[PDB]
Symmetry: C3
Subunit: 202 residues, 3 copies
């Protein structure tokens, strides 16, 4: 027989999730913070976390296949805390699966993909805990997704995908206010997307 | 292709799980008449107990009685409309390993669903739990989940979530407990036919 | 209908996972996995390190004193021996199966002495150390990490020093190799 697995999602998305690093002058340069990013398309556009690349002397993007790029910050967005990078790839880029017709449902099994404590790309699984909106009017457009898929420093900017490897959101920061568990957030993919397209227009 | 999901169990059980506050734990609308279960410590020495359903309705609830030997309490609300109730299959045998979902109101963030499995069904002899019939789960439990529901992939009530374990040396992960539904169904009827 | 479950995995593997005590009193605790019927159990070295007496307890209630037969500094794995008055349950092993990231996996050990507990996660990474998010806590060391078929994927070790859902395991291949090396003596 075959083991229960969410390996089909891991194979379709893991390759498009890169390791992001923020290096700054101390000569002598070092890593201020590190996060993750999702290669959106073969033009070299990546979506990451704004707090991960803020005040960066050098932005280093590292794919899973060994390739290391020096990236360019195209622009970030405050309301959602997203930032968009750009790399110059010539050998072909692995991209994240996207299904624009899909609508995320509470309970859907979801996988978080990121670089917790720089231990190297890790995959954690949970479900979509809730979906809401932060801002004026609770009935407004969905702003965030909540998941219990373990999130840690280094996951910021990463991808939230369902069991078909489809993009559901861009992991953000976790929750902290005793010592909470299984509470993490992401920006819906339909929103992450619309912002990128905007930003890619300067 | 269809995405793997537990949304079914959710649509079935979440409507029946309420937000408890006073003038903030959680609760489960056991049956039509308006009987709501919760933990006795959730409502202990509280003033006006307020109960908010996921459909936005809000009611005042009266403590129809709690039970110290199980840390459970039963509340009553007089609703005019129809009420949502938690699915309950009395012929179901909870097994260790069954996928389970915890529904509650963590840090008053709004109703959330967390998934884990049934870690244990009970315990033999002295133990950190202090009890024998506790259902142990690794589905994320936080302050506010107390009193909420523990359901399986069909939305059936497995137990009533209880106080979080946040320890004697370091912060534990994936350790939560729930009171068996079979025990809550007993304690409900008793506190009911007892006034 | 029937609830989605990983009980099959529990039934197959859990009987073989034991609770290891380091005594005297209790200086520390962990878990172990019965590699074969005669009573050979694998656990981690740090759990039974410097023990006046090694107590092993089966999930069925029986309690046996253990003999530290040997260990391996390299992988931090130790081997214990107990004499059961009959054949003992063994952890399922399938040397032909290749662990994949994303594979559902269960953690079986004795967290905070609560008693045997099963937590679930997935293989988060395979980069000779396996990484999983199946909740691991103090007392889980030396325990079993199995997939949905009860097959052994690894011996859980010590967690990540607050980080959430980061735990590692020593590949079952290594445990198998280390068990044969010590039984042969």
């Amino acid at each position: 027989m075959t083991p229960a697995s969410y390996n089909l999602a891991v194979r379709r998305a893991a390759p498009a999730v890169v390791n992001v690093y923020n290096r700054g002058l101390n000569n002598q340069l070092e890593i201020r913070t590190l996060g993750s990013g999702v290669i959106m398309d073969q033009r070299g556009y990546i979506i990451t976390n704004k707090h991960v690349i803020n005040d960066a002397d050098q932005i280093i993007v590292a794919l899973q296949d060994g390739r290391v790029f020096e990236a360019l910050l195209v622009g970030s967005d405050s309301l959602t805390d997203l930032a968009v990078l750009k790399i110059n790839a010539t050998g072909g880029l692995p991209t994240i699966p996207i299904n624009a017709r899909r609508v995320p449902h509470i309970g859907d099994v979801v996988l978080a993909i990121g670089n917790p404590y720089n231990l190297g790309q890790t995959i954690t699984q949970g479900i979509i805990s809730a979906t809401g909106r932060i801002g004026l009017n609770p009935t407004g457009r969905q702003n965030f997704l909540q998941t219990d898929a373990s999130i840690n420093h280094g996951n910021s900017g990463g991808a939230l995908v369902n069991s078909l490897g489809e993009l559901m959101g861009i992991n953000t920061l976790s929750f902290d206010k005793e010592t909470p568990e299984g509470i993490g957030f992401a920006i819906p993919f339909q929103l992450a997307t619309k912002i990128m397209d905007k930003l890619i227009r300067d």
